[PDB]
Design a protein around this ligand. Structure first.
Ligand SMILES: Nc1nc2c(ncn2[C@@H]2O[C@H](COP(=O)(O)OP(=O)(O)OP(=O)(O)O)[C@@H](O)[C@H]2O)c(=O)[nH]1
Ligand SMILES: Nc1nc2c(ncn2[C@@H]2O[C@H](COP(=O)(O)OP(=O)(O)OP(=O)(O)O)[C@@H](O)[C@H]2O)c(=O)[nH]1
Ligand SMILES: Nc1nc2c(ncn2[C@@H]2O[C@H](COP(=O)(O)OP(=O)(O)O)[C@@H](O)[C@H]2O)c(=O)[nH]1
Ligand SMILES: Nc1nc2c(ncn2[C@@H]2O[C@H](COP(=O)(O)OP(=O)(O)O)[C@@H](O)[C@H]2O)c(=O)[nH]1
Lengths: 51, 431, 430, 40, 51, 430, 431
């Protein structure tokens, strides 16, 4: 799903794109939880963490 | 001053009755709170046929709703015109009939039937003069078919001379809703033949066809079908409620329509049914009304009149019209289609005219056709009943309610004899 | 007024009950604390003066772990503590242990609580017994409970959502044994038995949900959605309402033949959702697809006798009629000659609610097709040789004998399953 | 701040006194064709 | 006040009827929207414009 | 000018008297303090020089609780403090206790106050005795008081609105015993006895007023409405006035036969009101409906001997004549061969006043039908085997013997009730 | 103004009485210092049933405490409500009875009984009207059983007509506390049959079972059992103390319960007893309270009613309730369980309604059942007494007190005759 939503094949997605992916997987997920997981995955990044 | 006692049975019957009472209150200018807001004297002139005046200005329908489960009546009460009905006329049980004519006729319908007859008698004695009872319900359902047939038998026993009219929704030919529809229809037709003086057969698939082809609607819910049924139900008795140039009551229709006592099943249709797109394209004339009237697509019965022969046909027109026009039109119809009309009856048309058309329509007309085409519908129902009964599938559910296996075959025999009579008068030759 | 008493026996029963009751809470808005911020809940919940709602359910198990998991999880303030009944010793996959020695006191207490529950119900549509055929607790204790319910309550409609062992894959070894025993028991007590297979639901999850590692939580969520669709007509109004009593009338032709295949549609993840139209005809076709069956039993082998379709959401009678007409004209779908209609369509205006944390997508339409078809005899045919293969050597038979059973019980169960096979063959034949 | 209560008319007291007039008025109030016992 | 239970039953019946009335009004609005679709509605107006 | 002395004996008597006197105060405009802001109150209240009106009633009971409730409630400044008579020890459902040992001094004081009340009345239509057949106080003390009144006052018409035990539902165990004893007592003393059953009035409340939880307050309100309708002709003018002496002379075919069924119409809540015409014919039909009877005794079983109709409100003699003619032509209602007329119609122009806080609606028309019919023998038949079933084992006989009874008293009461059965059969037969 | 004289006997009786008086003071809003702090008129309206007014606002219980050892009443005085009781009502000896019925009835009970009757007469003469005496004590203990039976005999001699109500803690079936419990119980039951007008039987093991199964307590001390007993003692007489829709005094209960004089033994139970977890989960309806009432586990006696037949049963409901609802529930119970009810009594239920429920509870209900199930309890006591008496174990202790061996035989004969009467009315057939 992340690959389908990643148009540039860059391996990285924005917050909106990965929240969309996580909602397509599990509808109940909010954006804050996804962003928190993004931060704990990559601490210092300007978005675009590797999916 | 000729009163009619309306009865609704089952979910389908209750929905049809609610739509019908909404339509009639609209015709008579009655708001859902019961007050008159019509601004027309003829609306209040004959309001007593269907309604009774309460202590205030409220008018309550002379309607009795019967059911074994309270959900349908809760929906009816909460509908837009749910408050006009007197709350005591909602007679409901607690355990619904599981599409079981036996449950609705013998086991569970028996206890509620005395409450129902108490309400019916209370409403009937209040009537100054009583034209009769009209019962709207669906063949092929447990509480509807079962308790309807039981109540019709009881009312026939109590008031044999009074008119009995039935609006029965026969199970549809092609797409059947429940499995046990042939059983319920077989057990209900046997009762209707013996008891009901006048019976009008409706098919949901014919209704879908007419609303898809004439009305050309895209999403026809049950509301639209109930609306068409309500239109016919009003138009049959509008000659009682409104002055007519050539008026004709229910008993006159029955006398002119029924040649022999058992041949009292009729297919009905309403005109003019026009799609919203073609409303401006169509021109409202008596010939146009007759053309749509005699179209087989307009029949709300699945059986088409082409296959059979018209024994009789009543046409109740509504609107300021020419009696010469109407009579000439019906004569030309008979002469053109003499092959489809029975030879040994000199005139196969009972033409009636009412001066008050339904709201919005300059003209209208309801058609009531007694033709041998209904033979094929009963034949199809029997073709399903025999297939199920040969292997006795689902027969244990009716047996566990304590009805004899011989009763099924007796009902089948009565249906077969009725079909035989229709064929006999289809192929009867004069002299 | 439309109360239904839910019984969950054994680990599988309780684990599918967790999903079922989470789904009901989500559907009716009831928070896990017990109360929600009318009377559509009365089928599953009884409200108190304080406004807090308690389910009319009973969690029965001879093992403490599964019930204590519920007592410790989020739904600890929802359920009744005494309604959660916990045993001391597990049945250890022994039907005799669960039916003759350990199950006695537990079933006595269970009947006590069931009387207390039924006393609080004005009406009573029936019992929903969710157990696991193939385990001592579910099979033995469940069989005893069903027998007691048949004796005392009488004609109340008991719908048994049983899970038989899969054809090839399984988790137990004496599973054919206790499955045959419990099938012998429940052939004569339950009114409508719904077959479920773990292998079939695993296949459904793998193919439709694209879950390469399906698990028991996913299986239970699917089962919960199916039961919710089954009960939707009791709680939410809609055109063509169908009842628990009407299930038996429109689905059971003869009293012995009451085992039913169940199929839900659509089963699509949200990533695949809104990528197809999901029309009524397409969801009906999907529901009639053999892969969508939750039992490893190809309907092509047999013939359909009855099919009750439960539509949820934005469904119109014209569309259900068109879809069913296409199904009738379809050649691969084959009906018995003695049932010309064979269809019981019922629509509901409440769309299926989506469980947050689940894989199912938010779809505006749903179909639950429960069918009586003679093909179901094939699964009994599989267990009938899986049983006799071990029974020839009397393997593991000492275990069952030790808790007060006899070789005669095994013989009678095998003979009755053979009779059921013969009855299925006879109904299938002209 | 004086409390007030509606004064009744002499016609009402006469109607209460007379059995015939009261009953005729009630019949007139009963219903709308020809009034039942309209003529006092 | 002494007859709380009778008043409670009256309130329960009133609440049930009001809730069912709300449901019926919502369903009536939805059904009116569904049945409004007909020939007059421009379902093929775009196709006519394109042709 | 037309005084009627009200007696309320026992808990049921006092509890129905509360509703009765609330209804009378509301109907006559008398505030609970005692005074109101011509001479229509003279039937029920005597006015003092201060302008305060005191009711001509006597609250008799051997238990202090019920009387002290009235002494503490809103009507503490209305009733005479000495008129409220309280005993020290309750009769404990013992007819012997209430008739032989405890009741003596109490009935002496009761006669003293009754004489004081009667000395203040120019005329005296009679007594209205409201007691409870089926309890020591009402049965025993009521019987003793009735006997003393018959001895001293003589020909004054005593109308006893007695409450008989219901056929199946009941609250006491020795209720058949003291009921048979009290029936023996009052067969020869009361002039017109009206039967009332809690089961019948509960059914009326459940079906007509839609009260799923009827109570004694509702029962007493209905009874009070019936009594006010009966007495309306004494207080308010109207065409076809009826008198207390006239009820007897038009209703009691023979002195032994003076028990009466009572029915009220209409019984409709405010919500159900103004949805029906409520015409005279319809309300008369309702009054003649067997369900509307306030006794669990189907009038179809017997034959009507006399029927007194008491109309309230906008009722015209033409309408009552048409309604009663339809009633006569009705096949289900059947009268005795020796009474061709059998009807005593009486109209009153006063519509029934509505008690605020009650369930009855404000209806412009009312009918109170009090009927002498041979069907009433059915309730005596039920009590006659309920009595002898206990009497065969002499259950609870020592309790009655301890307070000065003999087995001969029970035998005599049973034989007299059998004779009453025989008399009812004889008058019913041609 | 119908007073009741409470008497506590022995250690168990004194503890039960102290707890009962604490519960009654809580209901009437009486603090341990005796001042009224209830802020409700109805509490003071009938406070004279149990309490008398002191010099100020203090209210003194009408209780008489009996013992041969001062320790139990030292505990009573040291308890939270130990200062309400008048010091003159504490009557004690110096040497306690070593579980010797003979010591408590003949040797040591004789001297103190004069003071006991003096205190009883002093308390009774102050009463305006006297309903009777209620005596709380334990069968199977020396001072309790012996002194209680002797005092009951003396009070029966003095006041034959006045009610006697007894709450006797019959020795438990399974686990017995003292060895000589069968002797003491056998000797006391013979006295209670002759003297006690009305008797309730309580068992410590039945109380333990109910507090383990319904209340689900973990460490229930004797205080909890005494509190259950006290709830029953209050609820049996709450109709005397509070206004009721259908009130019923003790004599009414006795008349409606006792068919024959010797069959005056009853089993009692209290509703609603709810565990902490299920308190929000349980919904209080009259059917719910009746269902908990008629359960065998709710009975505070060891004997289960299923084995026997309900001769009679009184139910005292408390709270705002429908008399129709209560009567319908009891009629439904009788119809459903007609097998457990005596045939030759058409109605086996005496329903009473009080308008004031206990504090905190919306509504409550106490049950008093006369059933032949108690026959098995007496049979078990007989099975122990005969077993010990055949070898005359511990008989010398009773003999050395001036007690004849013939009295043991007479008591056993009387108790067996009572058992025979219970069996006769269990298997009696109508007509
Ligand atoms: N579909 C489904 N089946 C399950 C689930 N959990 C367990 N089962 C099945 O249930 C069967 C055994 O269940 P139980 O009898 O309740 O196990 P238990 O609680 O330990 O009781 P015993 O094994 O009999 O001692 C297994 O064969 C599984 O196939 C589940 O979550 N979903
Ligand atoms: N209809 C009706 N009946 C009542 C009412 N109150 C009590 N009863 C009946 O009255 C009977 C008992 O009345 P009483 O004998 O006076 O009771 P009591 O005041 O305690 O006096 P005793 O029972 O003699 O000791 C019961 O069986 C009830 O059926 C009431 O409010 N309405
Ligand atoms: N025209 C119309 N037909 C209906 C309606 N509801 C149900 N039906 C049809 O009526 C048939 C019988 O159902 P019904 O008698 O109402 O069920 P029952 O009340 O349980 O007996 C079904 O097969 C439905 O297809 C409705 O509102 N309108
Ligand atoms: N329920 C209850 N039972 C008790 C209590 N104290 C003692 N008992 C029981 O009462 C029985 C008899 O003891 P008891 O008569 O009080 O001893 P006595 O005072 O020396 O005669 C014993 O078997 C105890 O189990 C108590 O506080 N509550």
């Amino acid at each position: 799903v992340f690959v389908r939503n990643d148009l540039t094949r860059c391996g990285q997605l924005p917050v909106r794109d990965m929240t969309r992916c996580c909602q397509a997987l599990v509808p109940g997920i909010s954006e804050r939880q996804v962003a928190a997981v993004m931060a704990v995955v990559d601490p210092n990044s300007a978005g675009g963490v590797d999916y | 001053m000729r009163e009619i006692v309306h009865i609704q049975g089952g979910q389908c019957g209750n929905q049809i009755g609610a739509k019908f009472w909404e339509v009639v209150s609209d015709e008579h200018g009655i708001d859902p709170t019961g007050t008159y807001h019509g601004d027309s004297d003829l609306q209040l002139e004959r309001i007593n046929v269907y309604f009774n005046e309460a202590t205030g200005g409220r008018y309550v329908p002379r309607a009795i709703l019967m059911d074994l489960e309270p959900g349908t009546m809760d929906s009816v009460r909460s509908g837009p015109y749910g408050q006009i009905f007197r709350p005591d006329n909602f007679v409901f049980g607690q355990t619904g009939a599981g599409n079981n004519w036996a449950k609705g006729h013998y086991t569970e319908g028996a206890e509620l039937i005395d409450s129902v007859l108490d309400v019916v008698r209370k409403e009937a004695e209040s009537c100054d003069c009583l034209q009769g009872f009209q019962v709207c319900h669906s063949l092929g359902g447990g509480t509807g078919s079962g308790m309807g047939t039981l109540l019709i038998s009881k009312i026939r026993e109590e008031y044999p001379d009074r008119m009995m009219l039935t609006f029965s929704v026969v199970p549809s030919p092609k797409v059947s809703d429940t499995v046990v529809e042939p059983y319920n229809a077989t057990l209900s037709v046997h009762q209707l033949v013996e008891n009901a003086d006048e019976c009008m057969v409706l098919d949901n698939e014919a209704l879908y066809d007419i609303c898809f082809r004439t009305l050309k609607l895209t999403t026809p819910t049950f509301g639209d079908l109930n609306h068409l049924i309500s239109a016919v139900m009003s138009g049959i008795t509008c000659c009682l409620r409104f002055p007519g140039q050539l008026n004709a009551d229910l008993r006159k229709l029955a006398v002119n329509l029924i040649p022999f006592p058992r041949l009292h099943f009729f297919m009905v249709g309403f005109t003019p049914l026009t799609s919203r797109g073609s409303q401006q394209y169509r021109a409202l004339t008596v010939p146009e009304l007759t053309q749509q009237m005699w179209d087989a697509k307009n029949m709300m019965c699945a059986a088409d009149p082409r296959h059979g022969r018209y024994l009789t046909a009543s046409a109740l027109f509504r609107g300021r019209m020419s009696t010469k026009e109407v009579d000439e039109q019906m004569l030309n119809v008979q002469n053109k289609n003499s092959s489809y009309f029975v030879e040994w009856i000199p005139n196969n048309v009972k033409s009636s005219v009412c001066d008050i058309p339904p709201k919005g329509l300059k003209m209208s007309a309801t058609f009531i056709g007694n033709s041998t085409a209904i033979q094929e519908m009963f034949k199809r129902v029997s073709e399903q009943f025999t297939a199920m009964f040969r292997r006795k599938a689902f027969l244990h559910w009716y047996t566990g309610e304590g009805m004899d296996e011989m009763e099924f075959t007796e009902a089948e025999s009565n249906m077969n004899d009725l079909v035989s009579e229709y064929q006999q008068y289809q192929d009867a030759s004069a002299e | 007024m439309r109360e239904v008493i839910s019984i969950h026996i054994g680990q599988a029963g309780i684990q599918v009950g967790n999903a079922c009751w989470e789904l009901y809470c989500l559907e009716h808005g009831i928070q896990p604390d017990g109360q929600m911020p009318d009377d559509a809940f009365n089928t599953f919940f009884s409200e108190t003066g304080a406004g807090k709602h308690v389910p009319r359910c009973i969690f029965l198990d001879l093992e403490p772990t599964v019930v204590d998991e519920v007592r410790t999880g989020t739904y600890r303030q929802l359920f009744h503590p005494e309604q959660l009944i916990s045993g001391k010793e597990d049945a250890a996959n022994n039907f005799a242990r669960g039916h003759y020695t350990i199950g006695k006191e537990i079933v006595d207490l269970a009947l006590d609580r069931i009387r207390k529950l039924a006393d609080n119900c004005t009406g009573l549509q029936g019992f929903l017994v969710f157990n696991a055929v193939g385990g001592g607790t579910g099979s033995g204790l469940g069989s005893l409970l069903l027998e007691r319910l048949s004796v005392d309550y009488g004609k109340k409609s008991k719908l048994g959502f049983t899970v038989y062992p899969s054809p090839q894959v399984s988790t137990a070894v004496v599973e054919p044994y206790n499955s045959v025993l419990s099938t012998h028991s429940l052939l004569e007590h339950t009114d409508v038995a719904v077959m479920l297979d773990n292998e079939a639901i695993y296949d459904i999850c793998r193919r439709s949900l694209d879950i390469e590692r399906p698990t028991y939580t996913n299986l239970n969520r699917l089962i919960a959605q199916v039961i919710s669709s089954l009960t939707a007509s009791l709680r939410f109004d809609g055109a063509l309402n169908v009842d628990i009593t009407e299930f038996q009338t429109n689905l059971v032709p003869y009293p012995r033949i009451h085992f039913m295949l169940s199929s839900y549609a659509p089963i699509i993840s949200a990533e695949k959702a809104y990528h197809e139209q999901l029309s009524v005809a397409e969801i009906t076709n999907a529901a009639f697809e053999p892969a969508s069956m939750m039992v490893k039993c190809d309907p092509r082998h047999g013939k359909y006798m009855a099919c009750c379709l439960m539509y949820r959401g934005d469904v119109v009678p014209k569309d259900v009629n068109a879809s069913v007409a296409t199904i009738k004209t379809k050649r691969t779908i084959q009906f018995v000659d003695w049932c010309p209609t064979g269809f019981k369509c019922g629509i509901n205006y409440q769309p299926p609610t989506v469980v947050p944390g689940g894989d199912l997508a938010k779809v505006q339409r749903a179909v639950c097709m429960i069918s009586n078809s003679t093909a179901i005899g094939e699964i009994f045919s599989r267990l009938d040789h899986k049983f006799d293969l071990m029974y020839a050597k009397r393997a593991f038979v000492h275990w069952y004998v030790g808790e007060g059973m006899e070789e005669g019980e095994f013989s009678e169960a095998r003979e009755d399953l053979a009779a059921l096979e013969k009855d299925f063959e006879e109904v299938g034949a002209e | 701040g004086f409390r007030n209560v509606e004064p009744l008319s002499r016609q009402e007291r006469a109607a209460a006194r007379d059995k015939d007039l009261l009953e005729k008025s009630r019949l007139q109030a009963r219903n709308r064709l020809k009034q039942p016992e309209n003529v006092v | 006040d002494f007859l709380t239970y009778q008043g409670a039953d009256r309130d329960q019946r009133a609440r049930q009827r009001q809730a069912v009335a709300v449901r019926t009004t919502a369903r009536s609005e939805v059904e009116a929207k569904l049945s409004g679709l007909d020939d007059a509605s421009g379902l093929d107006d775009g196709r006519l414009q394109v042709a």
